[PDB]
Design a protein around this ligand. Sequence first.
Ligand SMILES: NC(=O)[C@H]1CCC(=O)N(C[C@H]2CCOc3ccccc32)C1
Ligand SMILES: [Zn+2]
Length: 140
Amino acid sequence: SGAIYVGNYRVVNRHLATHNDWANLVWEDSSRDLLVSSTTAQGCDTIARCDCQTGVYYCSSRRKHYPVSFSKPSLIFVEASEYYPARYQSHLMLAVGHSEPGDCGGILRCQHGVVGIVSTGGNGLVGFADVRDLLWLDEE
Ligand SMILES: NC(=O)[C@H]1CCC(=O)N(C[C@H]2CCOc3ccccc32)C1
Ligand SMILES: [Zn+2]
């Protein structure tokens, strides 16, 4: 589990969104595994606006933050899980790192801010949904 809290937005994995998230929906995209809802309180996270390919992510199944090298956001085939059939997921970045289903939502960050959240993984992979192109998270 986990979310990004920027401005009056809450960014979560679409497959983990709550009823309250759907009842206060701003934007969702199944192909990216992302959903954004509105919040009453202002958050403290800031979004990275960069092309970094190195950063650090939080892994809840290890209680640890790991430094990783990751690929550029791309269209990658992801195996079937409890939440999606086997399909192509867009804006996904891959790295070598530990991962388990409960880990969706951990933040990946670089020197500029939050880059994305855990969304895919398995066999020593972990995949991150990018949020750096969502410029509207910084305003309104
Ligand atoms: N964005 C998606 O399509 C995800 C939906 C939920 C989901 O469980 N997965 C499987 C991934 C998540 C990361 O970690 C692992 C490690 C082991 C097994 C499976 C997985 C895919
Ligand atoms: Zn950066």
